[PDB]
Swiss-Prot record, chains A, H:
Catalytic activity: RNA(n) + a ribonucleoside 5'-triphosphate = RNA(n+1) + diphosphate
Domain note: The N-terminal domain is essential for RNAP assembly and basal transcription, whereas the C-terminal domain is involved in interaction with transcriptional regulators and with upstream promoter elements.
Classification of source organism: Bacteria, Thermotogati, Deinococcota, Deinococci, Thermales
Protein name, entry field: DNA-directed RNA polymerase subunit alpha
GO CC, alphabetical: cytoplasm; DNA-directed RNA polymerase complex
Keyword Transferase: yes
Gene Ontology biological-process entries: DNA-templated transcription
Covered range of the whole protein: 7 to 229 of 315
Swiss-Prot record, chain B:
Protein family per UniProt: Belongs to the RNA polymerase beta' chain family.
Protein name as annotated: DNA-directed RNA polymerase subunit beta'
Biological function: DNA-dependent RNA polymerase catalyzes the transcription of DNA into RNA using the four ribonucleoside triphosphates as substrates.
Subunit structure: The RNAP catalytic core consists of 2 alpha, 1 beta, 1 beta' and 1 omega subunit. When a sigma factor is associated with the core the holoenzyme is formed, which can initiate transcription.
Domain of life assignment: Bacteria
Organism: Thermus thermophilus (strain ATCC 27634 / DSM 579 / HB8)
Swiss-Prot record, chain E:
Lineage summary: Bacteria, Thermotogati, Deinococcota, Deinococci, Thermales
Keywords: DNA-directed RNA polymerase, Nucleotidyltransferase, Transcription, Transferase
Broadest EC class assigned to this enzyme: transferase
Keyword Transmembrane helix set for record: no
Any single GO CC term annotated in Swiss-Prot or TrEMBL for this entry: DNA-directed RNA polymerase complex
Protein name: DNA-directed RNA polymerase subunit omega
Swiss-Prot record, chain G:
UniProt gene name: rpoB
Similarity field: Belongs to the RNA polymerase beta chain family.
Protein name per UniProt: DNA-directed RNA polymerase subunit beta
Entire-sequence positions represented here: 975 to 1071 of 1119
Domain of life per record: Bacteria
Signal peptide start-end: none
Known partners and oligomeric status: The RNAP catalytic core consists of 2 alpha, 1 beta, 1 beta' and 1 omega subunit. When a sigma factor is associated with the core the holoenzyme is formed, which can initiate transcription.
Length: 223, 122, 48, 61, 93, 61, 97, 223
RNA sequence: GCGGCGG
DNA sequence: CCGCCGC
């Protein structure tokens, strides 16, 4: 019978999706391909390169700042930004804070069409006296690109960062058997999706399926 | 399980910074492996540093790191030097039983899981 | 009557590996070689 | 009537099956192994209906 | 495994005790009618062909589900043997 | 380690570690070998083992 | 390659033509499913013969198994409602009907 | 730059399909689902039932006929027939040859719209006074059906045969490194399909693609 | 009760 | 140990 598409979504991070019944081994034919896409194709944001004025290397320590360069560049990977339109291919976030204050992601100076939905994200703790100024680059891409693959050089002395593009964290799918009066050899596909918040599990799934569809069509003209 | 390869030479990053750079470019070469006997951290940990726990696994899923590779990962309160696999295991257990804290309170991600290490976990 | 191989049936090789059929997999998704040729049976390594 | 219904009829399709699968809901059955040596020689499980002849058992037990 | 079997065990002084209460209670669920429950409102058991576990699939499942909450009381000699079944028929159709 | 307390694995590790140092050579513990209940054995005498791990439930064969 | 995912199975795997046989073990000799039926007229045992299958024996080896569990009624049931109380099995059947 | 779907089709059996470029790992995201469909889902034809005149059971022997009923029916499941229109749901091929001759699938009396691409298939060997007249029932279906599942009964003394409906014997896909693009990390999916003849490589591929799309839509109404 | 196989 | 198959 038609695939009952049931949905159980809490927040914008978790989203369970069940879909049965299905023919023999179709759950697997759908899930896996959806997965590979949900983690490789989905477009989003990730900090590309950072630059702290007084800092040179990747492994160091800024006085007045408990956090180590590495711990900080890490914290930034966690940052989730959301662009509003195509005109914003690469946006450089700027932020400077001194003295005895906690540096949160909301302390970055607001940008025109960019939004920071990762406010309270802890970036650094600046002690009594503590100059922390830097410029973190942000881009729109797909998948995961190692800081050694793209190597962005805004500031000749800056440091590249691993690109965390997919707004989707992990994907899990299960193919359990289900009953339908006559035959019991049936597939039931439930795929669970985890998102950082930029987009929801349900939107992502749809975008995925679309992307697959768009590709299926490319089989149109022979030669 | 964690992998160990070939130590083409000098394993001293335990102190030199030209040892982080050089040993890291020597790695980019064919000289120092992603899992070299280099005390504090084999170039394998210098290259990849993963913030969130998820961060680690995706890199895996994209082919950057094999599960059995020694990398560095930021967990709840510590910068831990453990492989993706180990970490993945942590999650599985922490998922089985919702009390994540009580999870890592009873597992040892310091050795490959043997029938006994699991026996005792049960 | 005709005995077609089914899940309960037990097969085994001349060396001593004896066993029963646990699941009859659709060629669709079972271990296939680079060239389209899929395998027929999958023996568990551990029993060797 | 229900009995004759199962006396010679081949399938009973989904409906008889729907009913069975409904009757077993939360009930469990016991299983026994060749020599019953210790109390675990028989354990109780929730039956999940399946195709064929063999009986699917859990690996850990 | 089972729903809060841990909680259940912690509510009785002995394992086998639990079973007995569980059982006899399943008996009352069907004997004196199936409405002799205590948690029928929102959050009562359920099945998946339809939402019909609301009537009579597995009794015991209810019992345990009901015992998980501080609704029922169980004791060595709580109520006089015969009087229990007489009062129950009266207040349950 | 109070009286009557059912010594858990950890607690038996302790005693061993202690015997290592040299503080105890034996151990006072309840056992069936000295139960008063004619036909039967009680909770404190049998002990921790159950299919479970908490103390033995009265009424166990 | 997997076949389910089309992704390889990390690590060469050995494969080949192995000669394997089917044994005189069909499951045709392995499954009787009895709900109720014929009983011996001398001892009251659910023996079989033609249309009714037999019931598995329970032996004491297995009773113990039960005793230990504290399987009171599960044991009672095996010695009564399921075996000798001609009025018990009766009430049982009816009840279930 | 849009998936240049190319084609190299020889006969009705072999049919390579190349499609590139694709973005990092989609060659595989597409390759496998299509493969899983191509083998399990594609509809075709197979010998559903047979009847020899003087034979009552499947385990019998016909005089002046080397091969046994079982050996023959087996050979019949190897028979690949091809209809041309839905109007042809159940066709019954009829054949009867006598004496010193070799019965080959070409000896079936032509059925106008439906054709047999399995000509030289050896059906049997007749000695002298070898009387073989049989009717073999054929159908258009999908998947594998055990002769015990359907149990076709045209004539009370006919014996049902096992159903082999997949018109494809083997599917294979490769994911080569490059064709064109700014970045070298690209996928080039080329899949080669093999068909018994009933339908064509391309024909299958398309149906496959459709069944895939068909399922994609089943994600519509939530609940 | 005699014989054969399986776990 | 339990299960079957046959004079
Ligand atoms: Zn005592």
């Amino acid at each position: 019978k038609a695939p009952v598409f049931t949905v159980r979504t809490q927040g914008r991070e978790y989203g369970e999706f069940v879909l049965e019944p299905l023919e023999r081994g179709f759950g697997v034919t759908l899930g896996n391909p959806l997965r590979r896409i949900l983690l490789s194709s989905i477009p989003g944001t990730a900090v590309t390169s950072v630059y702290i004025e007084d800092v040179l290397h990747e492994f160091s320590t800024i006085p007045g700042v408990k956090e180590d360069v590495v711990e900080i560049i890490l914290n930034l990977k966690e940052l989730v930004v959301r662009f509003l339109n195509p005109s914003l291919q690469t946006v450089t976030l700027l932020l400077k804070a001194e003295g005895p204050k906690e540096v949160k992601a909301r302390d970055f100076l607001p940008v025109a069409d960019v939004e920071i939905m990762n406010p309270d994200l802890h970036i650094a703790t600046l002690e009594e006296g503590g100059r922390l100024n830097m410029e973190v680059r942000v881009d729109r891409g797909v998948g995961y690109v190692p800081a050694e693959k793209h190597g962005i050089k805004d500031r000749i002395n800056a440091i590249p960062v691993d690109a965390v593009f997919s707004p989707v964290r992990r994907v899990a799918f299960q193919v359990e058997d289900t009953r339908l009066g006559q035959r019991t050899d049936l597939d039931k596909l439930t795929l669970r999706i985890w998102t950082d918040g930029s987009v929801t599990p349900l939107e992502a799934l749809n975008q995925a399926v679309e992307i697959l569809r768009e590709h299926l069509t490319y089989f149109s003209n022979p030669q | 399980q964690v992998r160990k390869e070939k130590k083409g030479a000098g394993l001293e990053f335990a102190t030199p910074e030209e040892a982080l750079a050089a040993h890291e470019r020597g790695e980019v070469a064919l000289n120092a492996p992603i899992k070299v006997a280099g005390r504090e951290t084999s170039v394998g940990r210098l290259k990849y540093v993963f913030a969130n726990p998820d961060e680690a696994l995706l890199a895996v899923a994209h082919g950057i790191v094999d599960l059995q590779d020694v990398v560095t990962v930021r967990y709840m309160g510590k910068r831990l030097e453990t492989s993706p696999g180990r970490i993945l295991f942590a999650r599985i257990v922490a998922e089985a039983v919702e009390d994540e804290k009580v999870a890592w309170e009873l597992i040892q991600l310091d050795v490959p899981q043997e029938k006994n290490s699991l026996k005792d976990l049960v | 009557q005709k005995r077609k191989l089914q899940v309960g049936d037990k097969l085994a090789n001349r060396h001593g590996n004896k066993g029963v059929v646990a699941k009859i997999l659709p060629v669709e998704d079972m271990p296939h070689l680079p060239d389209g040729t899929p395998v027929d049976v999958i023996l568990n390594p551990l029993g060797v | 009537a229900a009995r004759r219904m199962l006396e010679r009829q081949r399938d009973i399709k989904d409906e008889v099956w729907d009913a069975l699968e409904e009757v077993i809901h939360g009930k469990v059955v016991l299983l026994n192994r060749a020599p019953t040596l210790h109390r675990l020689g028989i354990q109780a499980f929730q039956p999940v209906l399946v195709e064929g002849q063999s009986i699917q058992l859990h690996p850990l037990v | 495994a089972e729903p809060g079997i841990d909680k259940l065990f912690g509510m009785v002084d002995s394992k086998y005790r639990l079973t007995v209460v569980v059982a006899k209670r399943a008996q009352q669920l069907l004997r004196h009618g199936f409405k002799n429950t205590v948690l029928e409102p929102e959050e009562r058991p359920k099945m998946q062909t339809l939402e019909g576990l609301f009537d009579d699939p597995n009794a015991v499942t209810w019992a345990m589900k009901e015992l998980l909450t501080g609704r029922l009381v169980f004791g060595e000699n709580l109520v006089p043997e015969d009087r229990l079944q007489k009062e129950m028929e009266r207040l349950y159709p | 380690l109070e009286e009557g307390r059912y010594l858990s694995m950890d607690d038996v590790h302790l005693l061993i570690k202690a015997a290592e140092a040299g503080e105890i050579q034996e151990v006072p513990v309840r056992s069936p070998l000295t139960c008063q209940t004619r036909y039967g054995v009680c909770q404190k005498c049998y002990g921790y083992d159950l299919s479970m791990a908490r103390p033995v439930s009265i009424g166990e064969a | 390659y997997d076949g389910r995912t089309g992704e390889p199975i990390e690590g060469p795997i050995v494969v080949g033509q192995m000669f394997i046989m089917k044994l005189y073990h069909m499951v045709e000799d392995k499954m009787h499913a009895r709900s109720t039926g014929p009983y011996s007229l001398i001892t009251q045992q659910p023996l079989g013969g033609k249309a009714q299958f037999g019931g598995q024996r329970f032996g004491e080896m297995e009773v113990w198994a039960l005793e230990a569990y504290g399987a009171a009624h599960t044991l009672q049931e095996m010695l009564t409602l399921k075996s000798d109380d001609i009025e018990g099995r009766n009430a049982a059947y009816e009840a279930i009907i």
